[PDB]
Amino acid sequence: SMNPPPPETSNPNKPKRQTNQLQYLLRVVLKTLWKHQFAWPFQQPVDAVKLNLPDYYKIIKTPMDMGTIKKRLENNYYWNAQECIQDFNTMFTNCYIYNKPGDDIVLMAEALEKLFLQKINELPTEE
Ligand SMILES: CNC(=O)c1ccc2c(c1)nc(-c1cc(C)c(O)c(C)c1)n2CC1CCN(C(C)=O)CC1
């Protein structure tokens, strides 16, 4: 009935690197989705307490959100671009698991995912 703690965003025990793919994921992919008119419900963990959704974290056991993804990129949580792409995919899949076809939040998720796929289909080459 409490919210879970948000996902880990900075792990000192993880090695860190800068790559053109990770720079692109923060500065092009995340930044573009972040500034979208429909971004705001995805910029932080679902607050199931304040929204009074007592079943949200009974159904969604792998929560993810763009606030968490942004901090993960900012703090080198991802070594491989695929780890970041997986987190975006998890965020969209959670929305489609919990919500119903035609729901306002689902139409918002679809618009962001369309933009996500447009941007990640132009990811730069791997070192
Ligand atoms: C100051 N406000 C807030 O902080 C606030 C308010 C409402 C929030 C909200 C945060 N987060 C969610 C949300 C997000 C996701 C990904 C979900 O899977 C679910 C079940 C809820 N909602 C409900 C949806 C907001 C957008 N919708 C519209 C504009 O119609 C649909 C409902």
Side-chain angles (χ1 to χ4, degrees), residues 40-42 44 46-47 51 53 56 94-95 98-99 104-105 108:
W40 62 264
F42 303 94
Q44 62 287 312
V46 173
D47 188 339
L51 294 176
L53 306 172
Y56 188 82
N94 290 343
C95 188
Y98 185 77
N99 301 287
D104 290 324
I105 191 59
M108 294 172 85

Side-chain angles (χ1 to χ4, degrees), residues 1-7 44-58 60-61 63:
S1 157
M2 293 191 75
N3 293 324
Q44 62 287 312
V46 173
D47 188 339
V49 168
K50 290 213 79 78
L51 294 176
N52 193 4
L53 306 172
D55 64 346
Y56 188 82
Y57 292 107
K58 300 187 186 298
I60 302 301
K61 299 302 190 185

Side-chain angles (χ1 to χ4, degrees), residues 41-97:
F42 303 94
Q43 284 175 349
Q44 62 287 312
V46 173
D47 188 339
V49 168
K50 290 213 79 78
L51 294 176
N52 193 4
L53 306 172
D55 64 346
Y56 188 82
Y57 292 107
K58 300 187 186 298
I59 293 159
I60 302 301
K61 299 302 190 185
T62 314
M64 190 49 55
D65 66 277
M66 296 204 294
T68 298
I69 295 166
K70 179 176 187 287
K71 291 176 176 162
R72 282 179 170 201
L73 284 159
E74 289 169 345
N75 295 284
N76 320 116
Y77 195 86
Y78 304 126
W79 183 261
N80 291 147
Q82 190 52 46
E83 294 174 274
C84 176
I85 293 166
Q86 180 169 310
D87 276 351
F88 275 107
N89 287 335
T90 292
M91 182 184 76
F92 295 126
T93 305
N94 290 343
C95 188
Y96 307 143
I97 290 168

